[PDB]
Design a protein around this ligand. Sequence first.
Ligand code: CA
Length: 159
Amino acid sequence: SSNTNPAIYQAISVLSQQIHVNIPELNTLQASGGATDLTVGNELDELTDAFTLAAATIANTAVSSGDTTNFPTNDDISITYAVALQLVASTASGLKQVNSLTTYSTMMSDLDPAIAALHVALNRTLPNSINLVRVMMLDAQQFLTQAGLTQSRASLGFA
Ligand SMILES: [Ca+2]
């Protein structure tokens, strides 16, 4: 009924900032041979927490009438989120091949409902904002499938 895009963008921005910390750390861990159940798990725990917090913040935000002209627009929110989710998806998929891990499926099963809760909260609080996210994920949704992030992928709209 009023515009709550600024509050929605703030939550997505906080989430993206966290993602831009944990994903580069996971990339360096994997490239350097330091990726273990413990070091990967610590990064994925922070990521899962960040998605849970973003979903709760947006769920508690009033439904937005939206804004298509002034920053942050509906598209600014969808694009900022989509770029962060592509980062998460490609790294989550690429970690499956780390032989040291014995907890991969578990880490992803904890992450998946947190991401999906974000998608549901975002698409309900800013109606249909997930649509452009899905478009930007048209190829990267393959990473979600390989990672077993099936609720994440379905809640974007993929069949
Ligand atoms: Ca798996």
